[PDB]
């Protein structure tokens, strides 16, 4: 399971240097550009929270929630993001999808309970993540490595804006061509 | 087995969708693989081949992946084939290839329909590294087409992240190739 990337973080990872602790962010925005292609997302957003954490927003499709466990429970612990629940201290996961928004947290990857929020007629999914300490030789996100890749992710989805906000000190940046 | 068979069920929750950009997500990550390699394996040199038959092929002089018997009984470079981040690409292939050079030795697998073949030991070598090379499934992706300006931007992107490696792409569809390399 979850236990197999924690105690072999390299075979998922490469490392638990400041690469490997990119390559969180990467699987994070990657999940949230592929509802471009797929999922007629127009805005993905990137903010760097000063505590370390990240959230990434998207207006995709909405993982999904229907059901006896809910798909992001699944999600969450079985494919590319499970590798970053995995290696965090904390996720918070809201998704906007079938009229409702709805809010899952995973402590230490251990899923709380889905909840069924307000009625809305947005959809998309926020990931927030949290990188372990215990885990990673740094926890610094590097502004530069981000901007670079959401420039390529822009670039190869025309008329996709992405957005860039560096909460721990206010630098912004917004990627856009085009289609 | 099962996990594999869970990829092909539903592979728009391992690579987004089966277009041009699910089968780009295959190359990224074999790519990705032997670019960490650069930092954690003291990897001077990544080569990317995009095969005529519209196989990949990607080789680098890390440490090799590990051969040795896993704690589950069969080789670990089967785990990582089975269970970690390239074995999307295993189900997502008709065919792979894994050559390692490691512990002293040349080592060569297949995987066929994403089934490890037997583990084979080669001829002794200095040299550490691996190459893998993988075949998308025509069944699975809506093209099977690579992009050369795409897998251009990557790996300049990876050359710049890691001074002082030097990535080779070469397209055996028309001969076109670029290298990238930035001095630390
Ligand atoms: C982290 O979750 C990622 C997503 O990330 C974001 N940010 O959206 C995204 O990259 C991608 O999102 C998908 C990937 C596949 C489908 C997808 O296949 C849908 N189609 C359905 O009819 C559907 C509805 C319910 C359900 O449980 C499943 C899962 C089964 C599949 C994929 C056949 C599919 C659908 O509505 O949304 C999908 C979405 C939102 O894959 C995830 C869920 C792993
Ligand atoms: C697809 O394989 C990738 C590798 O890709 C390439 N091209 O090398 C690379 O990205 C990374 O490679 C690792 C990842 C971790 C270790 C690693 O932790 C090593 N340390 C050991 O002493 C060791 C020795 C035996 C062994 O079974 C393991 C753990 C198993 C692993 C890493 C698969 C570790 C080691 O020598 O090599 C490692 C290597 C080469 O992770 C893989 C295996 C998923
Ligand atoms: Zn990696
Ligand atoms: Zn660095
Ligand atoms: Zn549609
Ligand atoms: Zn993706
Ligand atoms: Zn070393
Ligand atoms: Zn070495």
Known sequence: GLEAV?????????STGERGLH???????????????????????????ADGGVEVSDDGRGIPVEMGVPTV???????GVSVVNALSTRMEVEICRDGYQWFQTYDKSVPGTL????????????????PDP????????????VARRLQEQAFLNKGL????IDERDGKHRTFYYPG
């Not at 924690?6 to 490469?14: D, H, N, Q, V």
């Not at 215990?134 to 490595?145: I, L, N, S, Y």
């Open 23 to 49: 390559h969180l962010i990467w699987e994070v925005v990657d999940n949230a550009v592929d509802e471009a292609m797929a999922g007629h997302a127009t805005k993905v957003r990137v903010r760097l929270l």
């Open 115 to 130: 909840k069924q929020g307000e009625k809305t007629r947005k959809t998309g999914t926020v990931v927030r993540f949290w």
């Open 6 to 14: 924690r105690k072999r973080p390299g075979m998922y990872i490469g």
């Open 134 to 145: 215990d885990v990673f030789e740094t926890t610094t996100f590097d502004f530069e490595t």
């Open 73 to 79: 429970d699944v999600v969450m612990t079985q494919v």
């Open 161 to 164: 804006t992405i957005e860039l």
